[PDB]
Amino acid sequence: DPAPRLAGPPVFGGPGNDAFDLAPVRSTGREMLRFDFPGVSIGAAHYEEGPTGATVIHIPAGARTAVDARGGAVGLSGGYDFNHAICLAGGAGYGLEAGAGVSVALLERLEHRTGFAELQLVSSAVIYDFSARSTAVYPDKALGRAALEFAVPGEFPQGRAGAGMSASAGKVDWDRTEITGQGAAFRRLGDVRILAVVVPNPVGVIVDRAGTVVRGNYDAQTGVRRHPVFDYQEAFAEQVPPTTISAIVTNVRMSPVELNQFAKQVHSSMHRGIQPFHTDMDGDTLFAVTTDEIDLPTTPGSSRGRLSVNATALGAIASEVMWDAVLEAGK
Amino acid sequence: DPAPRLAGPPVFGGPGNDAFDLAPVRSTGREMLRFDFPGVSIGAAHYEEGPTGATVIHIPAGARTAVDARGGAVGLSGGYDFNHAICLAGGAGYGLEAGAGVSVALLERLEHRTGFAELQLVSSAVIYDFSARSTAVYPDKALGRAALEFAVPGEFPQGRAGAGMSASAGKVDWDRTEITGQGAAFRRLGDVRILAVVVPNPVGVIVDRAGTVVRGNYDAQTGVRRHPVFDYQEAFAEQVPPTTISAIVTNVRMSPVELNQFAKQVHSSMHRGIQPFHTDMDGDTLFAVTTDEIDLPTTPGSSRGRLSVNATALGAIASEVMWDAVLEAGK
Amino acid sequence: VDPAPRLAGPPVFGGPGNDAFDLAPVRSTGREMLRFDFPGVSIGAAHYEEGPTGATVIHIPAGARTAVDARGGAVGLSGGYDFNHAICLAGGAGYGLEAGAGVSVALLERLEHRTGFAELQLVSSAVIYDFSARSTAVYPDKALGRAALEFAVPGEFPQGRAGAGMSASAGKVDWDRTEITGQGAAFRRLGDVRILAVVVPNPVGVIVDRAGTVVRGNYDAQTGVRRHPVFDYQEAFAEQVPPTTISAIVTNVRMSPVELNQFAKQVHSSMHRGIQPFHTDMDGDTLFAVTTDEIDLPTTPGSSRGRLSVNATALGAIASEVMWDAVLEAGK
Amino acid sequence: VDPAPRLAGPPVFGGPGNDAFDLAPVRSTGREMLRFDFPGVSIGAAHYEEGPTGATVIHIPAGARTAVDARGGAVGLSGGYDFNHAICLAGGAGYGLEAGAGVSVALLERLEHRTGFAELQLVSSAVIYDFSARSTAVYPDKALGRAALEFAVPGEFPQGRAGAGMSASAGKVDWDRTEITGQGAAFRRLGDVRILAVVVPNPVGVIVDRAGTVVRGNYDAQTGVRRHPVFDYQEAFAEQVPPTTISAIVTNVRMSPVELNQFAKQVHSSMHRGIQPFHTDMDGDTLFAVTTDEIDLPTTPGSSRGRLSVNATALGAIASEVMWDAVLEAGK
């Protein structure tokens, strides 16, 4: 039962990027998650003038990726099956520009080599975060460059940081929408490593493992948050008749087919912690990335069961890491 | 905390259809759900010799449909965007034959007219139910004909009936798998009607709204059911290194795009009640069907919120009907 | 000389059904037998004269990785599996998917009714709507699919009016101009590399040869010639708006699931050379790309003929020619 | 007479980048201007001589329903929205998606930085890899996309080496045989029905005319002629295995999302007539089908030319011819 963070009513007429001398800020959030995942780096930058920002996951070696662009209102660039970086940003479709800044920065680091096998590949996805503030500032090329420059191994800024600066949840009615943030979680099991990163800007609300609504759809008249379905069902009885962007990164080798099905499974699992989810109103996009370092055993047995060690098993574990990250974003 | 229904170990060498004089049985289940949904009929038939069966949803006028074949191991026939019937069956891919029986029975009722606009369209999906018994009997053409002949408005046989005869859940290890069944639920809100039908044969387990595991992955050594992720995570720590078929039927007019996104949303929502879900091991297939009788208002407001009456709202309500149906199947 | 017409005639869209007849499957021989060498692949074609309608079955008992490209707007598909023991192509619109159920249960019987996972027999089926081309409602049923599998043999394919091609037809701007096609196959061996194409063209469009000549479909009995449909369509718009093909490509070259899927799309799109228009709303065009995984491509793609000359795309280009040859055999 | 060669020359795969130059956008004029009448649609083409590389922007300020058919195996796409205010086609591989960001922010500025939903400016962008055809790493950047939008005018299209077509090339079995193409457009009006095709062919394959002659790409300087790639591929397999095109079709005819999506697939597949091979692993082929929703098809599809003659498939067949004309203009 956290204190409310109501976003408040829309403001119109606000200034855009051209109005300011915009200075990127290295986002620190409310606290830093630290973890051990060699070969992965994360950077987060924001403009205070939005407030809005971008979060970049950089895997300099490049990593095989599956994309599950499941929502009805997706803002995606690249969506490549192999990436050197994933860029998550505010600013609606304008914020895809941040990924261009990452791309060209990587081209510069590569000394402008352009062989087809050396192209630097950045996939980007965005949230609409303009209802949560009163400017039109968006993550631009310079901000994406800055988020990459700020990237370091083994750290993630929780909360209002990067793409999470103006993320919000619970959009039955804007008077009940609350600011979320971005979140991350990490587990290591044996040699296996799983990192989840999420920027929940859902139409739905964030739900914990007990089924409590913990962020979004807060009614100041009652002091209580509501699951949206209670609102929806009563709206129907009255009147008829009268986005989350996310990444899961692991080091377990998966074939393209396993990796794709892993992405679908983990993404669907997020309907536990975000409700409703995968709606027409949402642009929900999950990237499943593997650094392809650790083999699963050829056969799937253990003391825990004959079918206990396989990609589905990994997907179930990763689903829990992701739920933890969603709850960090809503905290 | 229901009593266990352990399916027990595989049996091999069992007899197939050719060995028996197979008599269809009208399935009655453990109890009958009654509801008011003109233009929809449901029939369920089984062979005791399996035990295995088929469940047919017949909409004689035909209805617009979206299919969300999300699992990794799908057994689907037709998958049409307009259907006169949906056939759900056991018998793995062999059980798609039941839908052929429905199709030809409908052709006969149409006096063998064959104009392109008069083709009778049946979409079928199947579960693998051979690990839950010791015969190779499957739902054949005759059984699909029988399920159609047995179809009546406004009734559904809950539990071990039709396609649910030998459905089972919780497949980390076969020694912990439990028999489920089929389930249905129905709500009417104003003029809006929503019927959910489900045959859960998941690799995962059935979970209630409190987060309790209520069917599947039962350990006779402990007397307790386990969420699979506890098994999976310990299997990884040890060793590295050392299907649900469903339909939602409503009467609300939705465009092809709304109906498709509605299908995705409702299907993903089932990861609340079935965990894990949408895995590589599963052939999860949802049909979203509308009889296109009731308009939504042109604008989405109500006293409950500015964005409270739309297809996403309907999807959230339908998601709850579906969860109720899953819990009926597991009861 | 322009080919003689094979007009289908005016459709009635109905007639007696299967049980009005004592239906005996006939092993289809077509007009000619293609013979080829590709062990592990058998083809069977059966028909009912009383339709006339039929089914063609490709049986690969080892099982083979498959990509499905269901590109048309009116597809009739069952299974569509990424690994198949058989592919069943049939007439009878969606009713003819039943033929594949006959193949499936016959294969289960051969496996002594074993039902373990590695033992499930996987049959993907696709259909053409062939009811415009005859005055009956007979369709390929379980018995006909069983018969087509029983008749399957390696190294033979009956060209023309045979199996699923028995009542296939082309050129559907107006039914008065529609012509019977057939089924067709072609085969090439390049060293030990093997490519087999099988096609059952029932297009809304017409069959076109490598010169751009319309050779089957859209025959106007008032002119004695076949025009490209676009001439009819453009004239129709001036007046009124004033100011399925099912196919398989089978190869022995190893391709990963990703390469195989893209190969399927490439070969399928290539068929818009020989069938025009293609991939329309009005078509249920479905191509199965199957590999028996017997021989590897070299690790690098060079040859004397270029730096990017030996790869799955190259194989796709070669297979596209085999498929155009098969289309032309169907229309011959 | 066979067309003269335009060999691209041997690629070095790198060179100076954008900020090595003081880059001024140039309004591209190409070899010739196509003129046509289609109010509500503007086209702008800009290039950097220092690449050479460029971008071509189609601006539809009302916004228009769109279907995207990203059929190739190596696609570079941003947005891919089902409703667009602009389509941006560019060189520079994935770096050139940045040009579309320039278009997007220019449109936001025109809207006075309003950010409501109905006001979000939607730009879909696609790219070709044109770095093989020049010795620099200059790409279409935000400034070049802004310039292409500023230069956009109704009723004009610069054919040839212009905009995104500036360094487009064809026929990539071996880089020694690759030839510069260009961009191309064609237009037809049938009563008030309007169809505009725009294409930037950078294929692995070659451009083929209606006779089946290879007209651009795969020019062998040792023979003085262009062969179909399949001749090279089949010879390569004998030896070594011993025993992108981005495009738009814009029409004013109303089509539902379902019809429009199938129309996109149909027209895109039709391009395997003029580009061969096509839809390969090696290609990022992406077609945008856009309707401005100005005129209805009749409710029933009949005419004097047939019972099924006036429908979205018919429109697709006509549009496929407009697109082949555009491909040939690009290769001319």
Numbering used by the authors:
A (entry chain A), B (entry chain A): 19 to 260, 267 to 355
C (entry chain B), D (entry chain B): 18 to 260, 267 to 355
Paper's wording?
Nylon hydrolase (NylC) is one of the three enzymes responsible for the endo-type degradation of the by-products of nylon-6 manufacture (cyclic and linear oligomers of 6-aminohexanoate (Ahx) with a degree of polymerization greater than three) and various aliphatic nylons (e.g., nylon-6 and nylon-66). However, the post-translational autocleavage of the nascent polypeptide between Asn266 and Thr267 generates an active enzyme with an α subunit (27 kDa) and a β subunit (9 kDa). Based on the X-ray-crystallographic structure of NylCA, we reported that four αβ heterodimers (molecules A-D) form a doughnut-shaped quaternary structure. In addition, we proposed that the nucleophilic N-terminal residue Thr267 in the β subunit functions as a catalytic residue for either autocleavage (from precursor to active enzyme) or substrate hydrolysis.
To extensively analyze the effect of amino acid substitution at position 122, we constructed 10 new mutants in which Asp122 of NylCp2 was replaced with other amino acids by site-directed mutagenesis. The values of Tm (melting point of the heat denaturation) and ΔH (change in enthalpy for the global unfolding of proteins) were determined by regression analysis using nonlinear least-squares fitting of the CD melting curve. The Tm values increased in the order of Asp122 (wild-type NylCp2) < Leu < Gln < Asn < Arg < Lys < Val < Gly and ranged from 52.9 °C to 75.1 °C (type 1 mutation in Fig. 2). However, the D2 symmetry was partly altered by mutations at position 122. Plotting the protein stability (Tm value) estimated from the CD analyses against the distance between the two monomer molecules revealed that the protein stability exhibited an inverse correlation with the a2/a1 ratio (index of symmetry). In other words, the ratio changed from 0.979 to 1.197 from the wild-type (Asp122) to the mutant (Arg122, Lys122, Val122, and Gly122) enzyme, although this value should be equal to one for a perfectly symmetric structure. A clearer correlation was found between thermostability and the nearest distance between the side-chain atoms on helix α2 and helix α1. Notably, this distance decreased with an almost linear correlation with increasing thermostability in the wild-type and mutant enzymes.
